[PDB]
Design an enzyme around this catalytic site. Structure first.
Site, short mmCIF file in Angstrom:
data_model
loop_
_atom_site.label_atom_id
_atom_site.label_comp_id
_atom_site.label_asym_id
_atom_site.label_seq_id
_atom_site.Cartn_x
_atom_site.Cartn_y
_atom_site.Cartn_z
N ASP A 1 0.86 -1.16 -0.14
CA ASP A 1 -0.07 0.09 0.03
C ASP A 1 0.84 1.46 0.08
O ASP A 1 1.29 1.55 1.08
CB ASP A 1 -0.87 -0.26 1.15
CG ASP A 1 -1.80 0.99 1.44
OD1 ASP A 1 -1.79 2.07 0.80
OD2 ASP A 1 -2.47 1.04 2.47
N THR A 2 0.91 1.99 -1.09
CA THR A 2 1.49 3.35 -0.95
C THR A 2 1.18 4.63 -0.48
O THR A 2 1.34 5.56 -0.32
CB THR A 2 1.72 3.95 -2.65
OG1 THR A 2 0.42 3.55 -3.47
CG2 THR A 2 2.50 2.70 -3.53
N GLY A 3 -0.50 4.63 0.14
CA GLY A 3 -1.01 5.35 0.89
C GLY A 3 -0.80 5.22 2.38
O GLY A 3 -1.17 6.04 3.17
#
Ligand SMILES: *[C]C(*)(*)(*)([C@@](*)(*)*)C(*)(*)([C](*)C(*)(*)(O*)C(*)(*)([N@](*)(*)C(*)(*)(*)(=O(*)*)[C@](*)(*)*)C(*)(*)(*)C1(*)(*)[C](*)[C](*)[C][C](*)[C]1*)C(*)(*)(*)(=O(*)*)[N@@](*)(*)[C@@](*)([C](*)[C]C([N])=O)C(=O)[N][C]([C][C][C][N]C([N])=[N])C([N])=O
Lengths: 99, 99
Positions: free
Chosen positions: B25-27
């Site tokens: 997950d990049t967020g």
């Protein structure tokens, strides 16, 4: 654009005549943008995340330009802390993870 | 590998001698795993996500394998609905966002 992850992957989007900055989030199935003025009809929807559930309004078929690319899709408007572009639009602009 | 976003970007990790699946997950600025059995001393902590804030236990210098890639970092353990690999480990296996 190859985006490295040392900094939050934050991009410029153009939505509803408005300029916004949004986090690119592969862990978000949907696109949820901070509360905002959007033309049309919408339906009450509830989504969940790490803190718990939020009530958001759902807009279908809204045009977004994301880092200069266009896409049409469901956009959710609601009590999110940051604007999040999620996998429903991210597959639309050709975005992949790589390692 | 190159991962498309049609399905959730899920991966196999081995953490603490235990096999688990986690979302790339990049967020996520951090890595947060469901309650599990991890050896060590941890500090109390609170992270926020979409419908609020959770209270986690911070464990530093945890060794974690993601797809065969070894990485050492901080892992927050607590009531996340899904195991999340954030940008603190994603920059370690060298992962990027291309589009
Ligand atoms: C996956 C995960 C959980 C995600 C996360 C994210 O990344 C966040 N981060 C954190 O938390 C760290 C984002 C943001 C950042 C900044 C700050 C604020 C926050 C999530 O949460 N995701 C969600 C969203 C998207 C949509 N909504 O779409 C999701 O995805 N959700 C969902 C649910 C899931 C679960 N699944 C199962 N279990 N099956 C919904 N539907 O809602």
């Amino acid at each position: 654009p190859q985006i490295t992850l040392w900094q939050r992957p934050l991009v410029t989007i153009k939505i509803g005549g408005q300029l916004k900055e949004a986090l690119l989030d592969t862990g978000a199935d949907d696109t949820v943008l901070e509360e905002m003025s959007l033309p049309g009809r919408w339906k009450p929807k509830m989504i969940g995340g790490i803190g718990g559930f939020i009530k958001v309004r759902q807009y279908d078929q809204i045009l977004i330009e994301i880092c200069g690319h266009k896409a049409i899709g469901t956009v959710l408007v609601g009590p999110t802390p940051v604007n999040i572009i999620g996998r429903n639009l991210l597959t639309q602009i050709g975005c992949t993870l790589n390692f």
